[PDB]
Amino acid sequence: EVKLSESGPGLVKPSQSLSLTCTVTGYSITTNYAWTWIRQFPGNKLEWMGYIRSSVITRYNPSLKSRISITQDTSKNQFFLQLNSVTTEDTATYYCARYDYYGNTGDYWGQGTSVTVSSAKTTPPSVYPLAPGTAALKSSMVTLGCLVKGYFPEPVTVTWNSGSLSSGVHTFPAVLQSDLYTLTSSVTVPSSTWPSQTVTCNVAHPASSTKVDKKIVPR
């Protein structure tokens, strides 16, 4: 099928240039579709940035002045976004999508890539296991968790047992403080599954190219 995937640095210093890439698979970008960039600011406000269609035709949002550029690499079936002189106001989640003349995008949207414009430094997270102090209600359920603390910038991805454990999972929104984020994730499973079965939280922090796997062990 046709898939779009955004890629690029998740942190850019103010006044510098932001470059993102959207790799298209399953469909040629040399077609007459609006290969576009859209961004969503913290707060959820959505803004259309521009598009490139038929390999050589573009259109940009006037609000972006002359600092935006959309180009493509036909040989790699990728199109790009370049935004110069960024400020903290450009902090947002960037998405690529394929719009047709009628406004129909189908399910042709990327997963979105977070970009933070800040002078703060990149910091990998410390991952701590959250195991119950003693033995709660037996023959029932038990909640475990992982505390992902002190990282920058957002985001981190958290999964349990490499993704084989997804139900009963709650990963909370991160809280920012002193230029560092902290987040937690809880997972609830039958008192028969743990500690009988291993439960591990997998944390990834793209910005620091770091990955941590913390097994939850009884106190």
Binding site: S63, N104, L147, T188
Partner: protein, 216 residues
């Protein structure tokens, strides 16, 4: 230049009920071809926008028939028939007539369901964190409804408000409940100075708070 308005939220809708979401444009979206260029999107937490309707009333491929669009040229409505827990999220309309192709501010669909008491779990700092000189005590308050809830931390019986950070999840897509995390962060030295740590939850579902604690 075209501005589109939408209500921030909708009255809570019960599963099974149908609801209409509104969107109004400052200019007509009807084009010289007889078609009205208006899109309707649904975005779930952490998910990319999903197109539901384009050309004001044409359902996108694979979109449930429970979704339908109608309207004139300045007033549009998205009707969601027999709402399900899965439909929770924010609904955005987008005009596709002139540049820029501005989006509405979005309307969050809020589901209504039976009251549910939170499941409270408290966790002592891990040995790994204590080696860093820091000590975080975590409390999870899971699957409750309504979203309104209060959490209090007590150390050796005395309430502690400083160093507390809370985080709430969006409404769950499966059971329509909410969850919250509360973290009390202390230095290891301070944590070592006390014995009893308690997380107290006060929710509409009960007169008496739900207490969870441990002794260091």
């Amino acid at each position: 230049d075209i501005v589109i308005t939408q209500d921030e939220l909708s009255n809570p809708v019960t599963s099974g009920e149908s609801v209409s979401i509104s969107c109004r444009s400052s200019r007509s979206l009807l084009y010289k071809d007889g078609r009205t260029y208006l899109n309707w999107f649904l975005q779930r937490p952490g998910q990319s926008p999903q197109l539901l309707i384009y050309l004001m009333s044409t359902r996108a491929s694979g979109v449930s028939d429970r979704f339908s669009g109608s309207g004139s040229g300045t007033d549009f409505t998205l009707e969601i028939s027999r709402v399900k827990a899965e439909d929770v999220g924010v609904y955005y309309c987008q005009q596709f007539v002139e540049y820029p192709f501005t989006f509405g501010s979005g309307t969050k669909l809020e589901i209504k369901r039976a009251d549910a008491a939170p499941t409270v779990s408290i966790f002592p700092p891990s040995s790994e964190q204590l080696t860093s000189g820091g000590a975080s005590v975590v409390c999870f308050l899971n699957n409750f409804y309504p979203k309104d809830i209060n959490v209090k931390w007590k150390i050796d019986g005395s309430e502690r408000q400083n160093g507390v950070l809370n985080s709430w999840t969006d409404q769950d897509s499966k059971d329509s409940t909410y969850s919250m995390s509360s973290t009390l962060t202390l230095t290891k030295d301070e944590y070592e100075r006390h014995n009893s740590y308690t997380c107290e939850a006060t929710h509409k579902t009960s007169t008496s708070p739900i207490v969870k604690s441990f002794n260091r």
